[PDB]
Amino acid sequence: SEAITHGTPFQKAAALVDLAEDGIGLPVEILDQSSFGESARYYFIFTRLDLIWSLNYFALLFLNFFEQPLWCEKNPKPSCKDRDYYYLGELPYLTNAESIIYEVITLAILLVHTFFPISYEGSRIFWTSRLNLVKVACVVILFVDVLVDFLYPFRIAPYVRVIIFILSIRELRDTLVLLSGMLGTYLNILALWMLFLLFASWIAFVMFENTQQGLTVFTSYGATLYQMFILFTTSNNPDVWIPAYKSSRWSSVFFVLYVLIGVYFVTNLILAVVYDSFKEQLAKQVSGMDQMKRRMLEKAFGLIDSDKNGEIDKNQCIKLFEQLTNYRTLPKISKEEFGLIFDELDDTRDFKINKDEFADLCQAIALRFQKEEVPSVQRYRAFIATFITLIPSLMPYLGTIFCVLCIYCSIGVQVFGGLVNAGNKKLFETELAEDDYLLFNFNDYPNGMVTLFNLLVMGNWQVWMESYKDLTGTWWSITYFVSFYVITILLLLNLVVAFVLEAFFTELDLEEEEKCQGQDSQEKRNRRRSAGSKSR
């Protein structure tokens, strides 16, 4: 009945479906847990105990990562008029008595989660893992800031509480691999983007240095790199160039052509690269998954074959479909599937004897049958097939961005803290006061979390920018809001706009071939997929 616990039995025909199930649904057994001579030791007994308790672990992660909004501003301590909310937010701030209660519970599960794969890896393997020295070093930094906050800089706990949450889920770590391979392409297209703003902030400063434009908005060259940056974003379109329009009507020809080249030529070609870098980096992940599948099926192959000659006979395959617990009657399948597998050796009268034959067989049952069952509108179809596929497909690629904003909030709370006050006199002339944003704030953590969202939508995103270049007084605040743009024109065009285009072309292709596959043959022909995945 219950096929959950299996490492302690694991017969020669039963420890197949330990490996043959995990090759289908694609989980991971660790490579140290895979390379054993026995492959059913107390390592593997303790390993599936990690996957049992997994719902405790993610519930710790969102405990640790939703900690930060409930917790105090960096500076209420120098602040005058502390408790009275000057545009703060309605969430409570957990007190110092409430501090050690919430972090020690959080570390009591993180210390279990980090030092658990010692129970199935060697200490020369665990400590030489390099995605796991990172995860241990993140714990010790939290263990400092627990005990420092107990026994009483800028307190780098809330940055580490993100990076633990990034590395601990596989999806957000699998995503972040792509953003390292894409980064060597994106920085070149960033470098030919900055050249576009610089060469066209020069002509916009050459042309208008005499007139009523350069008297008013385009004074210094550093305030035409800055303005023409915001025109590239479109979000300041007619306001930049009214007094160059009002003076000579012909100066729209500069500005209606720069935004035309800027937004409709370059911005699609930053999208084109970051989509074309995605297609190569996604292929490097999927082939990084099939070698994980082939390195599972090769374990399943040699587990059955006793002499390890390199082959398995037909009768030695017939016993597997019953071990699969898949279909009712056995002998009508394996000889039927032999022709269905694209190449049969026919060196013996019955068997096809290779390793690569089985590694395609166990996946060939997967696409067709789905008969395991572990007991424990045509007009609108291609749109809502994708649109419902994309609620869990963009949970990593919109989870990375929610982690990028949990960093910029935590930077942006600290750099830009209790400045929007009720009584800051620079504020009441800014664009925050006149547009009455005066909230969307940065004065706390969740005030900042929303504000980065409006900066992410680009809905009037320069109101916040040009206020904090006047509240902080420096032009160095500009680099907070330019780096949000740059990093999230990868992340909003990689991870989303390139993904939702490819996600449509799957649920197009599954509609364009479902008319073809059901009419081409009664059974599935495998190489049409070999020409179909490389088709577009």
Ligand X SMILES: CCCCCCCCCCCCCCCC(=O)O
Count the residues in the chain.
536
Helix (H) or strand (E) run with residue 109 in it: helix 97-114
Residue 246 binding result from a copy of itself, Ca ion, ligand X, none, given CB thresholds of 5 to 8 Å by partner type: a copy of itself
Q: Is 254 in the site for ligand 3PH (CB under 6 A)?
A: no
**CB of 158 vs ligand X, minimal distance in Å:** 10
Which of 95, 128, 220, 306 contacts ligand X by CB under 6 A?
Answer: 220
* Nearest to a copy of itself of 133, 269 (CB atom): 269
* Nearest to Ca ion of 280, 336 (CB atom): 336
Q: Which stretch binds a copy of itself (CB under 8 A): 1-9, 136-144, 260-268, 515-523?
A: 260-268
Residues of span 174-193 touching a copy of itself by CB under 8 A: 188-189, 192
Query: How many Å apart are CA 244 and CA 281, to the nearest integer?
Result: 45
* Nearest to ligand 3PH of 25, 339 (CB atom): 25
* Nearest to a copy of itself of 389, 472 (CB atom): 389
> For 37-48, b where at least 16 C-beta lie within 10 A, e where not — what string?
eebbeebbebbb
Which of 296, 382, 405, 463 contacts ligand X by CB under 6 A?
Answer: 405
Residue 475 binding result from Ca ion, ligand 3PH, ligand X, none, given CB thresholds of 5 to 8 Å by partner type: ligand X
Rg over CA atoms, the chain: 30
Direct distance between the N- and C-terminal alpha carbons of the chain, in angstroms, rounded to an integer: 45
Per-residue contact flags (x/-) with ligand 3PH for residues 22 to 61, judged by CB under 6 A: ------------------------------------x---
**Residue 367 token pair:** 């696409």
Residue 305 binding result from Ca ion, a copy of itself, ligand 3PH, none, given CB thresholds of 5 to 8 Å by partner type: Ca ion
Q: Is 275 in the site for a copy of itself (CB under 8 A)?
A: yes
User: What are residue 342's phi and psi, to 5 degrees?
Assistant: -65, -30
Residue 250 binding result from Ca ion, ligand 3PH, ligand X, none, given CB thresholds of 5 to 8 Å by partner type: ligand X
User: What are residue 505's phi and psi, to 5 degrees?
Assistant: -85, -10
CA triplet 207, 212, 215: central angle to 5 degrees? 90
Which residue matches tokens 């390379």? Answer: 35
Query: How many Å apart are CA 218 and CA 208, to the nearest integer?
Result: 7
Q: Is 305 in the site for Ca ion (CB under 5 A)?
A: yes
Which residues, 6 or more positions from 37, have their beta carbon under 8 angstroms from its beta carbon?
none
**CB of 235 vs Ca ion, minimal distance in Å:** 4
Q: Which stretch binds ligand 3PH (CB under 6 A): 164-172, 198-206, 275-283, 490-498?
A: 164-172
Q: Is 136 exposed, middle or buried (0-12, 13-18, 19+ CB in 10 A)?
A: middle
**CB of 169 vs a copy of itself, minimal distance in Å:** 20
Query: How many Å apart are CA 291 and CA 285, to the nearest integer?
Result: 10
3-class DSSP state of 218: coil
Q: Is 69 in the site for ligand 3PH (CB under 6 A)?
A: no
3-class DSSP state of 237: helix
**CB of 356 vs ligand X, minimal distance in Å:** 43
Q: Which stretch binds a copy of itself (CB under 8 A): 148-156, 288-296, 311-319, 436-444?
A: 436-444
Read off the amino acid at residue 495: L
Which of 90, 307, 373, 436 contacts Ca ion by CB under 5 A?
Answer: 307
Spacing of C-alpha 61 from chain mean position: 16
User: In terms of DSSP H, where are the helices of 396-498?
Assistant: 399-415, 431-434, 445-457, 462-471, 478-490
Q: Is 189 in the site for ligand 3PH (CB under 6 A)?
A: no
Q: Which residues bind Ca ion (CB under 5 A)?
A: 235, 305, 307, 309, 311, 338, 346, 458
